[PDB]
Symmetry: D2
Subunit: 187 residues, 4 copies
């Protein structure tokens, strides 16, 4: 019908440009919200103010925290198996996620496939990563300096930090011994 943005927030954006609401042609408002014909109209104002569109929605989505915190339950959220050409590779389970840090992706992974399983590196991630081995023994492989493959074995209680965009893979060291890790991507 109409696209709403928070008045106070929009007024602060205008103030960084030394403007007020009067400097916007023909928008309507009420006590708390400013109304736009649609995204296209909003884009035009954004262009005029030389602010990117994203800024106009910052802080508009309601926090999903309760009292400064958010709780998630085992087996409670998103989960799926990862199966590639008939080979069961991972179980991916979301741990707590929040709209107060969309850059945080915390996972619990079951590692299902073995030694006769082929290498399938990722392309690396913009996020930093720390991984901790909750159970079993885990083969970690990654692409090091001068694009050379490296490897090591992480046992229960070991951990690893991985810089952005380093390509890497986690598999069971033994096979038939299913291992588990927690992987936290951030920043």
């Amino acid at each position: 019908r109409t696209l709403a943005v928070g008045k106070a927030h929009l007024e602060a954006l205008l103030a960084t440009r030394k403007m007020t609401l009067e400097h916007l042609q023909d928008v309507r408002h009420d006590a708390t919200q400013v109304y736009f014909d649609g995204l296209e109209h909003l884009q035009n104002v954004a262009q005029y103010l030389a602010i990117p569109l994203s800024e106009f929605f910052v802080g508009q989505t309601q926090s999903d925290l309760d009292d400064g915190v958010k709780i998630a339950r085992r087996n409670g959220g998103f989960k799926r198996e990862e199966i590639r050409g008939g080979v069961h590779y991972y179980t991916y389970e979301h741990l707590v996620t929040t709209n107060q840090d969309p850059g945080l992706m915390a996972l619990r992974l079951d590692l299902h496939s073995d030694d006769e399983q082929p290498l399938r590196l990722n392309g690396g991630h913009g996020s930093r990563e720390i991984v901790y081995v909750t159970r079993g023994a885990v083969r970690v492989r990654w692409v090091g300096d001068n694009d050379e493959l490296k490897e090591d074995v992480l046992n229960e209680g070991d951990s690893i930090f991985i810089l952005p965009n380093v390509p890497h893979s986690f598999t069971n060291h033994v096979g038939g011994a299913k291992s588990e890790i927690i992987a936290i991507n951030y920043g």
Copy 2:
């Protein structure tokens, strides 16, 4: 009424959560963009992905630079008078502004007030500031340590740096002798 989100961007957000476009119920798309019925539909997806609405437009604004640069012309952009409690204080003129740094607000100001008029401090602001005097003699007043008023006179070629949230005011030292400054707010 329809809302467009960049497909590649949205696909990257979904991939960090180990999802694909198939995991979104009733969206349509084309080669480059994903379409939502309206804000209400978008808010649902945001909820489902536990991301704020702003994230869907992050990075997606087209640069307003041409070849790494952007040029602005005297009197070419926004301008207005600033009147504070009945006293004509400034003329604000925008210098170059760019969506590649929405936090940069560079201004040319004419000064209109003086000692015959009452002081009208601002409340300070988040941005750092450097000011340079292009013409005339400028009385600067600000709130210092222990909330005490301070003052000095800046002549042509002098400059001043102001820490965030220090309240301040620039007026003509002589009065009827109209002065000019450049103010650059950043960060």
Copy 3:
């Protein structure tokens, strides 16, 4: 006593100030380093360049990563007991830490307190936090909206995100104490 600063780095700093090494009094150098008589001499140059002393060492710490990565082993690093007002609260064990992200503090904690002991909240901290329960049942208490105490129980596989500066405490839900958590502080 003979303080060394990286030459290339110092040259870049000088270049931002439109200076060269010739504009520094009384420093000697070699191919890779610039030498100062002492802190007193360095503090003078810092004053002259209007930079803080810290800047002279920014980026100059050698990375502790090997090939983009760093590995730590269970029981391989720092640990200590935490006793708060006479109550044995935690065992803190460092997981991997790196000088490439000093804001990342990943810990494994043993929990030693319960309800038969008094509450000992921390003061909160600047870092975001995600915690995951590896073993047992964990009472989590925190200070919520309007400074009211809140509580919940986290079981094995549950996780929790805590916003910066929210004061909080983790104890065993069941008296007779040994639950375990992984706590990752970041950003």
Copy 4:
């Protein structure tokens, strides 16, 4: 070698440690690079130990500089007198800010001498005269324009560029502010 106690305690707290010499306000390191060892042990870079410990050069939230009051020099690039560089206010509260006033001395009769670009963003404003600006654009192609009094330009990091007089013999002036 002295470090602020409060600051060091906060650093130790991020590693779940405490002071495991000092006085009320400061902590002392004997080896002078005894400090590098502790930094290594905490896996914090050395620089962090001095953050916030240089005394502010502001007076009451502000810092004032005067024309001709600070650093100044001539810039001669290939036997060609190119700029006069004059520092405007500089502060240790933002070591990333370099604000300059430049007199321009070269023109089209003299060869082009681009810089290599730099890490800072830049905004420039023309206080006097007419200024020829040349820069390296997309696909490493040269571009040019003329900026008159009151015009301004924003330059992305690492774009190589040059400012000269458009007319020549007609000496122009700019203010250049580098930040972030």
